[PDB]
Amino acid sequence: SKVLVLKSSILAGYSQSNQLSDYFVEQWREKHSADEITVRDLAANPIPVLDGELVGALRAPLTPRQQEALALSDELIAELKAHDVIVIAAPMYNFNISTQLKNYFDLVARAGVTFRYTENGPEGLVTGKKAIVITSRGGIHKDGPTDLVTPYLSTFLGFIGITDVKFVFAEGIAYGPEMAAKAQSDAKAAIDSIVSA
Amino acid sequence: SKVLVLKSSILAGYSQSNQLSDYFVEQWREKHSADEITVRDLAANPIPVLDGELVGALRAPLTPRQQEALALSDELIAELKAHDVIVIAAPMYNFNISTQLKNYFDLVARAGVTFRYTENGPEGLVTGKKAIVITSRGGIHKDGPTDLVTPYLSTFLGFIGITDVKFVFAEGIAYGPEMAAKAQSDAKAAIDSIVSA
Numbered sequence: 534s535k536v537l538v539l540k541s542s543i544l545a546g547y548s549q550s551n552q553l554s555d556y557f558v559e560q561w562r563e564k565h566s567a568d569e570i571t572v573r574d575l576a577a578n579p580i581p582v583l584d585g586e587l588v589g590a591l592r593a594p595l596t597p598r599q600q601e602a603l604a605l606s607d608e609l610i611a612e613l614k615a616h617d618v619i620v621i622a623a624p625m626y627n628f629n630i631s632t633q634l635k636n637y638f639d640l641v642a643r644a645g646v647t648f649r650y651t652e653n654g655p656e657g658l659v660t661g662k663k664a665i666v667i668t669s670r671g672g673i674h675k676d677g678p679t680d681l682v683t684p685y686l687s688t689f690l691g692f693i694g695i696t697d698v699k700f701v702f703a704e705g706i707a708y709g710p711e712m713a714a715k716a717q718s719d720a721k722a723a724i725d726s727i728v729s730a
Numbered sequence: 731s732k733v734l735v736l737k738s739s740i741l742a743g744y745s746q747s748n749q750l751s752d753y754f755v756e757q758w759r760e761k762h763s764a765d766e767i768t769v770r771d772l773a774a775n776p777i778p779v780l781d782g783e784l785v786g787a788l789r790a791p792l793t794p795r796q797q798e799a800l801a802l803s804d805e806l807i808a809e810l811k812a813h814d815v816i817v818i819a820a821p822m823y824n825f826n827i828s829t830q831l832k833n834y835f836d837l838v839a840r841a842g843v844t845f846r847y848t849e850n851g852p853e854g855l856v857t858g859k860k861a862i863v864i865t866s867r868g869g870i871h872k873d874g875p876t877d878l879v880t881p882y883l884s885t886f887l888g889f890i891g892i893t894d895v896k897f898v899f900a901e902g903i904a905y906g907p908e909m910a911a912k913a914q915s916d917a918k919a920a921i922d923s924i925v926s927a
């Protein structure tokens with residue numbers, strides 16, 4: 534199969550979610566060595582903000598920026614549809630995903646391409662995929678009312694067709710080195726049983 | 731009192747939430763004519779994305795961008811703390827708030843300035859405010875599991891100290907002109923009873 538890995542942290546080499554994504558990649562190479570792996574770093578290779586000009590590109594003549602945004606949109610969507618296993622690193626910043634991941638989503642959700650309207654409702658067109666979300670947090674939010682990242686990621690991914698999603702959590706990072714080490718260990722075992730299952 | 735109005739739509743003059751915000755302003759001038767009103771349009775006056783360079787500004791020597799981001803942060807925070815009634819236009823795009831509003835939040839949430847850590851927990855420092863959220867949506871999501879915007883806005887605002895929040899909804903816009911007119915009418919009556927209460 535082909536694996537797509539999306540990195541979205543702004544902390545580069547010090548990112549906890551990037552370290553876990555690299556672990557996921559190392560283990561998939563190990564266990565499934567015939568597979569291809571593509572990594573896109575949405576912080577090191579930024580997607581532009583969706584503004585009032587660029588929204589027109591996804592929807593007569595187009596401006597220079599509009600033409601670039603559309604070309605970028607078609608590229609991102611093709612890449613997404615060309616891979617089988619989608620890994621998404623989703624650190625929580627101010628109770629939301631990172632703006633780096635958000636901008637990718639805003640260029641990826643497009644009527645008649647990644648979803649469509651029908652009489653049985655709106656319908657996702659990115660089908661047959663398996664997704665794994667790796668979500669790191671400073672505090673402890675899991676299964677509680679301050680975690681809106683988790684259900685938002687299920688809702689958005691479900692909307693474009695990706696209903697098979699598994700979640701891996703690295704929480705309690707802000708409490709220090711030893712809690713961060715525990716988070717890393719626990720998340721890595723969660724990953725191990727996904728890679729082998 | 732002083733009213734702050736934050737606009738975040740990317741659709742300019744065709745925005746449903748901007749039309750409702752202008753109505754709110756017209757009626758507050760009408761009923762409370764001694765008050766001052768400040769409007770910031772976060773689409774027409776964009777806040778930059780929070781990246782790995784700018785996060786350093788909110789936290790030794792600082793780069794040129796870092797210095798600008800910090801100056802902008804201090805301005806936004808002072809403005810927020812200087813007003814009594816905070817009105818926030820929050821259109822839903824791809825099941826999230828707009829990136830234009832998000833960037834404002836990412837520059838506004840800052841340790842030791844808008845919140846702080848204590849032994850009774852983290853604690854908001856923007857206190858004594860009343861907030862009204864005007865949230866427009868194409869579909870119908872209210873009180874259901876696809877509305878993650880509403881609880882995310884309660885959580886983020888509560889975190890910086892603003893626990894008094896009222897919500898005004900304009901839903902069903904994508905169903906056409908007459909449903910949009912109904913949404914406008916219903917939201918406007920919601921606004922009328924806030925302005926007079």
Ligand SMILES: Cc1cc2nc3c(=O)[nH]c(=O)nc-3n(C[C@H](O)[C@H](O)[C@H](O)COP(=O)(O)O)c2cc1C
Pocket residue numbers: 542543544547548549550551624625626627628629669670671672673674706707785
């Ligand atoms: C700008 C900023 C905002 C943050 N907001 C939250 C927060 O909302 N809740 C939380 O539990 N931790 C928060 N944290 C801590 C991060 O979630 C934590 O450091 C996590 O490891 C981030 O993943 P990363 O290291 O891969 O970037 C924040 C950190 C920063 C940089």
Ligand SMILES: Cc1cc2nc3c(=O)[nH]c(=O)nc-3n(C[C@H](O)[C@H](O)[C@H](O)COP(=O)(O)O)c2cc1C
Pocket residue numbers: 588739740741744745746747748821822823824825826866867868869870871903904
């Ligand atoms: C980029 C884009 C994404 C949208 N996503 C959603 C959606 O997630 N759910 C929904 O009900 N409507 C969605 N809509 C419709 C808007 O929520 C609706 O048009 C609303 O009026 C937006 O507020 P505004 O007119 O003030 O910009 C979307 C529209 C656009 C432009």
Ligand SMILES: O=C1Oc2ccccc2C(=O)C1C[C@H]1C(=O)Oc2ccccc2C1=O
Pocket residue numbers: 627628671672673707708839847848852
């Ligand atoms: O829950 C916590 O309790 C603490 C107690 C003492 C010292 C640090 C912390 C934390 O970092 C967090 C997590 C934490 C959080 O829960 O929400 C946030 C929102 C915005 C920015 C940062 C954060 C956090 O670090």
Ligand SMILES: O=C1Oc2ccccc2C(=O)C1C[C@H]1C(=O)Oc2ccccc2C1=O
Pocket residue numbers: 642650651655824825868869870904905
């Ligand atoms: O629920 C709906 O049902 C429809 C039936 C027929 C024609 C149009 C629509 C809609 O626009 C929506 C709302 C709607 C929605 O619920 O989610 C979205 C997510 C991303 C982008 C746009 C949207 C929408 O327009």
